[PDB]
Amino acid sequence: GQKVHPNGIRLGIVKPWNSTWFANTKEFADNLDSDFKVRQYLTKELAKASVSRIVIERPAKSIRVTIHTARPGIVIGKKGEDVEKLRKVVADIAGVPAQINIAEVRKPELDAKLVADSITSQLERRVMFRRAMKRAVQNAMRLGAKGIKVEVSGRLGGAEIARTEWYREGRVPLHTLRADIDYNTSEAHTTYGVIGVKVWIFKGEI
């Protein structure tokens, strides 16, 4: 290890918090807790929903929760299916009137999360890492953007000797706070080991 989180390092500027709200030592303890339960669950029943981030606003006993996804319709439900379920599931989980507003992801090829959850899913589909890692991710360069650094952990392909891979385009100056980058992880528990992946998309400068 020898790298600072390209996201948290910027959590101050050019990067909003995926959970903005106030709280005091009292409830704060169980507060961030519920947020985890709800957030962890919203993925379980919406994995293939192609969900990106998941913000969580909190005014007063009424969390908002915004499920950003490239596939909104599927996260919507049969004109009330999905929404109702989730919006209701947030019952005792937070013991408060929790809403839920979906956000459409523009260009699902420039968002880290997706580009990460995807490549990993392809790997689980018995596919050559190099191919997808390169091409199936190279797209982020065709819909725009200036630079995208990918990274696949070890154990790739039949081999006991874990190895990391490079492959990067444009420029990803993660040494610039005013740079703003879309970083996110993604695992892939396969027949053996847990081939990981890290997406570094440089979406413009300042």
Partner: protein
């Protein structure tokens, strides 16, 4: 006595923004009765995750509006005129009403 209010979206800012007053706005001139937390205004929301159908979806969000009072209990001039010298904070509503 001039009363001051600070309502941010978290302590990450509402903290420094308030300590500033007690430190700067409160030296010897201003009296300052004390920094209070006050009840937080919790406003959560439920949004249907899936686009159309799947009522059983829904996602819950929320925006905690953290507030603070404090307020100076001494209308002087030498110290009650050293607060305007503070207008930073990219998000700390400061309703300086009397």
């Amino acid at each position: 006595r001039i009363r001051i209010r600070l309502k941010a979206f978290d302590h990450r800012l509402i903290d420094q923004a308030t300590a500033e007053i007690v430190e700067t706005a409160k030296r010897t001139g201003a009296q300052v009765r004390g920094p209070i937390p006050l009840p937080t205004r919790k406003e959560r929301f439920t949004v249907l995750i899936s686009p159309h159908v799947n009522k059983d979806a829904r996602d819950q969000y929320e925006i905690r509006t953290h507030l603070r009072l404090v307020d100076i209990v001494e209308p002087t001039e030498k110290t009650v005129d050293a607060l305007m010298r503070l207008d930073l904070a990219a998000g700390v509503d400061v309703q300086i009403s009397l």
